């Protein structure tokens, strides 16, 4: 149904997130690549070359992206967002849905800037992650003061085409950022280290990478399809006296769990500072 | 459209692994549940009740499993394998392919036991993991002395229906056990801790669990479908000065990578003891 | 079990704890229990006297009175005891060894030199049998009749949890529930110190910490849910509990308790490796 | 207390735990209890329905039914609740706040704007009231009659330990027995992992570890002796237990539990510092 | 042959410290127990029952203690001192010497309270410790603005009967609190741990406790009676290659010395907060 809606989508910013979302949306068949336009003052990026190869329209002029779009994603660094809103705020129209993907930036700050121009800007804040590029993203969104009920449902339909999507209260989004926004990086670090461990124990690197990634994918999928606690799933792998429980002990002795808690906390706290500095 | 109409499968042992594989095989459609039989001296097990509901035939007698089966999975704890082989060795026939899933137990030790009863037993050793239950397992196998080329091909066909499967030299299997065999437990531990971090920062536990698992699944899928190094994918998530690179620093400060190397090593080393004692 | 006579070789902490639990339970009157020790001026001996237990310095007298005979001496003393009373075992006897680490095989070997078919059971229990909340496992020997294991389970269930195990599990049980009360007492003392640091009187802090641990343990015993699921019910988002759990994780709290069970289990095996 | 009607604002974990403990105790029939929550499709709501508790989406209905009204919503929601139902308090009412950190002063301030003399009690309890082994403290407000504190203690004693405290102790109690069950569940999971590492089946390891902690806590509650003296009774010289205690000490085990009580207490105060 | 026949002593507070001092004074023979009175709002205290058995007069009313007493010890918790001074300030007479034992509470704050009722209150501040109960305390005192020279001499005479006593400038007392006031607790902790070490190595607990305590008592006495540096005495016990120097190395490896410095510092710093808040 979204395809026949023939939506025009725009991205202010043409970097990693714009590429990941554009690739996921077109892979999902919801959007035609040429119905997406992205803007950036820097075309010498690999992301821009990849978007061009996809068939996405590219332009240096953010105003052109605004005029083209029905749904406008803000995909620039947090400190760039106020600059962006000053530049194209006069060009936001009643028809637009403005979707901010920027870490930390509040709906209130966005509506404050845009309401100086037209009085009821339709704003949605979201946080997502790069696995939308394989349509396995983890996305949350919050609706602003003037977003219609149909605006939230449209956003959920669009973002559900590239992974999990659910509405939340805005005060949860900084924490989501620390968990699933930054989460793929924690997983890539873990997969690299698990592969090093495989290689230390005699496996070829290529096989160690493949096996570790498949292990993590399958374990995550079991948890998503199970009602059981992750400790109960872990118990089903931990035979008495066996290999797994010996490995779990050395993780515990290093405070493995605490490091992952530290990471979510550190990303969430930094996300809050990215807003305060803007 | 795969289906083994002439294959009768039996499990010696009716525990977690027998349930995971039988559930995966029946979900994949490659085997009808009534062509599978499992034996265990304990029918008051939660996995026996679950196998019964699928339609798997069950018996207390290991000899009946052998007599019913062409492909015979040994799904008992490593120290039980020698008793099992003594019990049913005289019942092994030309048609049997014996597939040992036990951690650490060598092909040579199994062939030596079964050869006392009848020369040329057809033995395959495999290592898999519990995510075969959602058809996302990671499986390796090695062929024994008397396995025919068609036996390994058939086992790869069967095990590929529930996840990744590839042939390896037997001397890699203890290390695979430490990486992908124990791997799901490392992932469950990591997901439990990531959720704790989400809860600390204000997320409801249910949502934190869902988002953490979705982030790990998506990242693993990105790696499996990419030609790039986990570090390059990680670089795409680590914007300069951003939330993610701040979180990655606190992981590095605790030696996060070294803990996962420690874990693979400890599981691999213990697996070799679940045999050197044997 | 109404005409059953019970003896303890050794009149120390465990014999007191079991005899107190047994008599509180009603399953044994104190006058059916005898205990022996070479030192009648002991504190536990004085306590057993007050309860109505019969006391003798002579281990032979304990044996002649007893149907069920508990060995409650230190592990390195078991061989000496078996050499002293071996000629007095009488086929009516069930010999129940409580000593950490000492195998059924080593007991049957010493006793078989005197009479061929000694009925031996090995158990591991803990001091909370004194308030009838012990945790006990037992394994039956080569010549223990089926009714021997059943009588043992009837008796020990009166003072806490009791189940039969294979003998090769008992050293690990020792490291978990045998030593476990000491882990709990250490934890309770530290939790109380934490309460005192934040301004609670010591007596209130001890009471509250102990009541919290008892209640949580009961909750888990009465639940089918994973301990992590019960923990999630207490960890409200952003709240006080999840902040405390983080500082426990950061110190490797879980790993220390794993270390402890392991160290106790390994030492238990060592006590027997050096015995044999 | 036979014509006493009780309400809960909030129908979550604590309301379930208290209502289950109260009805198991016999002190309250389920039909004298009403609970309200904006989400009737909740798991705890479904459980309270099965027990016989009356449920409504409307907090005003809970207030009109109740004599004793428990506030069992998250701390940041208390001010909203008081603004919604303040005009409905009726002088027959005793308002019992269970929320972590929220002071009697802030509750009396919000309610006094509607009617001058609200009868307020603040308590801190824990989830083991669900098996009638909770640990509860309470402090009486400015307008709580003497009989108000006595009725409160009668009710909460039916589900565990209960004593009156000065309000300035309650944040510390929160860090000790309020959060304490989570420390115990974490410890029980780790002790079980230790049992499994040394070869025990998981189900046996969970049962034994939980039984050991329950029994030890009971022993201390029934003793006048210091927790170190009880620990000495388990630490035989050269034995398995003292080897395990050493590895706990070497990891700073005691300090981690002090850290935990402190961190929970401090966070509790912070939740109120940010409220006010 | 010391005895204060004209001195009536009172304690505001009837807890650990009042019991320790009254027991020490009566054991030293310098005061008859019936010339001592103590007040507390709680008679169900174990220290009240003990004071009663010695023959100390007891009352719930602090005003009666003041009216009976010449030397008045304030033996209540620091935050109770201002309430106490408000309650009985109007009852302070020319004859009274007010001796505050409360941690952290300054002479200036006590004189300011009592001066509102009657000018020139005679105030002494002391820090002592529980071993006065065995006449081996460590006590310091500072004299207030209106204390006469004979008041300090008399207090030194009295406090010397239960241990070491010396006059100090008031600004040393918070540090003395961290060293010898809290000191006995460090020693009890050390003795409990030394006994645990003896038990680990095979000693019965009773004997380990006796030997550890005797070793600490003897070593402290050697130092007090020697003109030599604790290091020189330590060198006499550390034979080359021997048992002791091996044990000293493992203490050094854990930073043993730094922990005790940390403790004195933490107690001193907290003591200053038990007043800066006041
Ligand atoms: N990379 C990720 O994993 C995710 C990123 N985000 C958020 O998405 C936003 C962008 O992140 P990345 O795309 O990773 O950054 P990136 O740095 O790859 O791309 C940034 C883009 O913005 C462009 N840009 C700079 N100034 C501009 C201007 N004045 N007008 C238009 N475009 C301008 C840059 O040229 C570049 O194309 C950030 O706010 C980040 O928090 C959120 C979810 C995940
Ligand atoms: N659980 C896992 O994650 C995986 C386990 N494995 C291997 O699978 C084997 C079994 O693992 P789980 O199924 O997890 O064990 P499990 O303990 O869940 O099931 C063990 C089964 O063996 C049965 N059994 C015991 N004695 C028997 C006998 N004499 N004859 C027949 N059945 C008997 C038990 O009753 C139970 O049904 C082990 O060797 C393990 O190394 C390999 C890969 C992953
Ligand atoms: N205390 C505990 O927490 C538990 C201890 N155990 C086992 O119980 C046994 C005893 O432990 P405790 O009772 O704690 O020791 P304990 O030292 O309190 O009592 C030992 C008793 O043995 C007596 N004894 C010494 N030589 C003797 C002899 N030749 N003949 C007779 N009695 C003699 C001593 O006089 C003393 O009364 C040990 O083997 C220990 O492993 C098992 C589980 C729990
Ligand atoms: N869970 C525990 O271990 C204990 C919790 N507490 C306190 O109990 C209070 C509740 O804790 P839990 O019950 O664990 O939270 P919970 O989240 O399980 O239940 C919270 C309930 O409040 C309801 N709620 C939300 N907004 C509401 C509104 N406007 N009107 C009425 N109900 C509303 C929710 O629907 C939910 O049913 C918190 O203040 C916590 O500090 C105190 C001691 C122990
Ligand atoms: N315990 C120690 O090791 C030493 C304590 N101190 C100081 O001694 C003072 C008391 O210490 P402890 O005796 O250990 O306290 P404690 O708590 O054992 O005794 C305190 C006494 O004060 C009483 N009290 C409370 N309110 C009162 C009031 N309004 N009027 C009269 N009495 C009242 C209590 O009932 C109790 O009898 C504290 O200021 C402490 O800093 C100084 C040196 C060492
Ligand atoms: O029991 C489960 N597993 C998973 C792989 C190895 C084996 C073990 O832990 O011994
Ligand atoms: O740039 C990528 N990401 C992922 C989530 C938040 C953002 C950051 O690190 O600031
Ligand atoms: O949510 C549960 N609890 C238990 C006591 C304090 C509160 C919290 O964690 O904030
Ligand atoms: O002495 C007491 N106990 C408890 C179980 C093992 C034994 C020991 O420490 O050796
Ligand atoms: O030389 C002194 N000492 C003291 C005790 C043992 C001996 C030593 O250190 O070897």
Contacts of D235 in chain E (CB under 8 A): 196, 199, 205
The rounded Å distance from CA A21 to ligand 8 centre is: 39
How far apart, in whole angstroms, are the C-alpha atoms of residue A30 and residue A51? 17
Q: After which residues is chain C broken (C to N over 2.5 A)?
A: none
DSSP per-residue string spanning C5-64: -EEEES-SHHHHHHHHHHHHHTSS-GGGEEEE-S-TT-HHHHHHHHHT-EEES-HHHHHH
Ligand nearest to the CA of A60: 1
User: Quick one: which atom of ligand 1 is closest to the CA of B244?
Assistant: 3
Assigned token pair, C7: 């003896």
Token pair for residue A153? Answer: 């449902």
SS (H, E, C) chain B: CCCCCCCCEEEECCCHHHHHHHHHHHHHCCCCHHHEEEECCCCCCHHHHHHHHHCCEEECCHHHHHHHCCEEEECCCHHHHHHHHHHHHHHCCCCCEEEECCCCCCHHHHHHHHHCCCCCCEEEEEECCHHHHHCCEEEEEEECCCCCHHHHHHHHHHHHCCEEEEECCHHHHHHHHHHHHCHHHHHHHHHHHHHHHHHHCCCCHHHHHHHHHHHHHHHHHHHHCCCCCHHHHHHHHCCCCCHHHHHHHHHHHCCHHHHHHHHHHHHHHHHHHHHHCC
Residue located nearest, by CA, to atom 40 of ligand 5: E102
Return the best residue to mutate from C230, C236, C237 for the ligand 8 pocket (most ligand atoms within 8 A of CB): C236
CB C77 near ligand 3, within 6 Å: yes
What ligand is nearest to the CA atom of residue E128? 5
Chains near A with 3+ CB pairs less than 8 A apart are: B, C, D
What is the SS3 assignment for C151?
A: helix
What is the distance of C-alpha E194 from the center of its chain?
A: 24
Helix (H, G, I), strand (E, B) or coil at A95: coil
In this structure, the residue with its CA closest to atom 5 of ligand 7 is A181
d(CA B58, CA B259): 42
- Asked whether C12 lines ligand 3 (CB < 6 A), one says yes
User: Contacts of residue D237 in chain E, CB cutoff 8 Å?
Assistant: 199-205
Measured CA to CA, the distance from residue E257 to residue D176 in angstroms comes to 31
Min Cα distance A255 → chain C (Å) is 5
Of the candidates C228, C229, C252, which has its C-beta nearest A255's C-beta? C252
Contact indicator for A90, A67 with CB cutoff of 8 Å: no
Way it was determined:
X-ray
Ligand 1 nearest-atom number relative to CA A41: 35
Question: A250 with B266: CB under 8 angstroms?
Answer: yes
Nearest Cα neighbor of B72 from B53, B54, B94 is B94
Burial class (CB in 10 A: 0-12, 13-18, 19+), C22: buried
- Which residues are registered as beta bridge partners of C36? C9, C56
Q: Which helix (H) or strand (E) holds D160?
A: strand D160-164
User: What is the number of the ligand closest to the CA of B179?
Assistant: 6
Tokens in use for E122?
């005679």
B209: distance to nearest CA of chain C, Å? 11
**Angle at the Cα of E210 (from E208 to E214), degrees rounded to 5?**
115
Interchain proximity A234–B267, CB inside 8 Å: no
The answer to whether B123 and B110 have CB atoms below 8 angstroms apart is: yes
Q: What is d(CA A233, CA B188) in angstroms, rounded to the nearest whole number?
A: 7
How far is it, in rounded angstroms, from Cα C209 to Cα C194? 10
Instruction: For residues C249 and A257, give the distance between their C-alpha atoms in angstroms, rounded to a whole number.
Output: 7
CB-CB under 8 Å, C174 with D261: no
Cross-chain residue pair A235–D202, CB shorter than 8 Å: yes
> Which resolution, in Å, applies to this structure?
1.8
Q: Are E97 and E157 in contact (CB under 8 A)?
A: no
Residue in A136, A179, A180 with CA at minimum distance from that of residue A160: A136
Comparing CB atoms, the residue among C183, C219, C266 nearest residue D130 is C219
List the single residue in A with minimal CA-CA distance to D201.
A240
Say if the Cβ atoms of D197 and A241 lie within 8 Å.
Answer: yes
Cβ within 8 Å, pair D237-E203? yes
* Pairing of the two strands B137-143 and E163-167: unpaired
List of E strands, A28-155: 36-39, 57-59, 71-74, 97-100, 122-127, 137-143
Query: Chain centroid to CA B17: how far?
Result: 7
Ligand 6 pocket check: which of B182, B183, B184 to mutate, most ligand atoms within 8 Å of Cβ?
Answer: B182
The reply, when asked if residue E185 is annotated as ligand binding, is no
Are B201 and A268 a contacting pair, CB within 8 Å?
yes
The whole-angstrom separation of Cα A198 and Cα B179 is 6
Is the shortest distance between the CB of E244 and ligand 10 below 6 Å? yes
How many Å apart are CA D35 and CA A105, to the nearest integer? 38
> E strands along chain E, which residues?
9-12, 36-39, 57-59, 71-74, 97-100, 122-127, 137-143, 163-167
Cα–Cα dist B78/B110, whole Å: 11
Residue D208 near residue A264 (C-beta atoms within 8 A): no
- Rounded Cα distance, A34 and A18, in Å: 14
| Ligand with the closest atom to the CA of D242 | 9
CA E257, E258, E264, E270: dihedral to nearest 10 degrees? -160
Residue E49 contacts residue E14 (beta carbons within 8 Å): no
User: Smallest CA–CA separation between B197 and chain C, in Å?
Assistant: 8
B196 contacts C245? CB cut-off 8 A: yes
- Using the 8-state DSSP alphabet, how is residue E104 labeled? T
CA distance D144 to chain E (A): 24
Whether the Cβ atoms of residue C219 and residue D168 lie closer than 8 Å to each other: no
Q: Is the dihedral of CA D155, D159, D162, D167 positive or negative?
A: negative
CA Rg value for chain C: 21
How many Å apart are CA B218 and CA B238, to the nearest integer? Answer: 16
CA of A271 to the centre of ligand 7 (A): 8
Q: Do C264 and D243 touch (CB under 8 A)?
A: yes
Count the helix, strand and coil residues of chain D and give each as a percent rounded to the nearest 5: 60, 15, 25
Lookup: tokens for A228: 């059981």
For residue A74, list its beta bridge partners. A12, A100
Minimal CA–CA distance to C119: which of C159, C147, C100?
C147
Helix (H) / strand (E) containing E209: helix E205-224
Atom of ligand 8 nearest to the CA of D127: 4
Preferred mutation among A228, A237, A245, A248 to probe D, highest tally of D CBs within 10 A: A245
CA nearest to D245, candidates C250, C187, C128, E206: C187
Residue in chain B closest to A229 (alpha carbons) equals B192
Look at A262 and B254 and tell me if their CB atoms are within 8 Å.
yes
Mutation for A interface: D186, D187, D202, D204, most A CBs within 10 A = D202
Contacts of B174 (CB under 8 A, 6+ apart): A201, B104, B268, B271, B272
- For strand C6-9 and strand D68-71, is the pairing parallel, antiparallel, or unpaired? unpaired
The answer to whether the Cβ–Cβ distance between D193 and A249 falls below 8 Å is: yes
Q: Taking CB atoms and an 8 Å limit, are D197 and A246 in contact across chains?
A: yes
Chain D residues with CB under 8 Å of C213 CB are: 180, 184, 213-214, 216-217
Q: At what angle do helices E230-237 and E205-224 cross, to 10 degrees?
A: 130
Within 10 angstroms of residue B206's Cβ, the number of other Cβ atoms is 10
| Cα-to-centroid distance, A236 and ligand 1 (Å) | 42
D238 vs E193, E196, E201: nearest CB: E201
């Amino acid at each position: 149904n979204l395809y026949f809606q023939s939506m025009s989508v725009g991205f202010i910013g043409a970097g990693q997130l714009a590429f990941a979302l554009a690739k996921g949306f077109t892979a999902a068949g919801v959007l035609a690549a040429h119905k997406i336009m992205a803007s950036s003052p820097d075309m010498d990026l690999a992301t821009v070359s990849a978007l061009r190869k996809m068939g996405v329209k590219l332009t240096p002029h953010n105003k052109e992206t605004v005029q083209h779009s029905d749904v406008l994603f803000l995909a620039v660094k947090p400190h760039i967002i106020p600059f962006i809103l000053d530049e194209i705020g006069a060009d936001i129209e009643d028809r637009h849905i403005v979707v901010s993907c920027a870490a930390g930036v509040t709906i209130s700050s966005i509506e404050k800037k845009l309401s100086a121009f037209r009085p009821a800007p339709r704003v949605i804040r979201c946080m997502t992650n790069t696995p939308v590029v394989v349509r396995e993203g983890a996305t949350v969104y919050a609706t602003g003061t003037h977003a219609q009920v149909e605006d939230g449902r449209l956003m959920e339909q669009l973002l559900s085409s590239v992974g999990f999507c659910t509405e939340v209260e805005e005060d949860l989004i900084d924490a989501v950022t620390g968990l699933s926004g930054s989460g793929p990086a924690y997983a890539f670090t873990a997969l690299d280290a698990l592969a090093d461990g495989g290689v230390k124990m005699g496996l070829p690197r290529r096989l160690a990478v493949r096996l570790g990634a498949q292990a993590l994918l399958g374990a995550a999928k079991m948890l998503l399809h199970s009602e059981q606690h992750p400790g109960q799933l872990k118990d089903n792998v931990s035979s008495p006296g066996g290999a797994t429980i010996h490995a779990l002990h050395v993780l515990e002795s290093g405070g493995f769990r605490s490091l992952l808690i530290n990471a979510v906390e550190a990303s969430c706290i930094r996300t809050r500072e990215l807003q305060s500095m803007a």
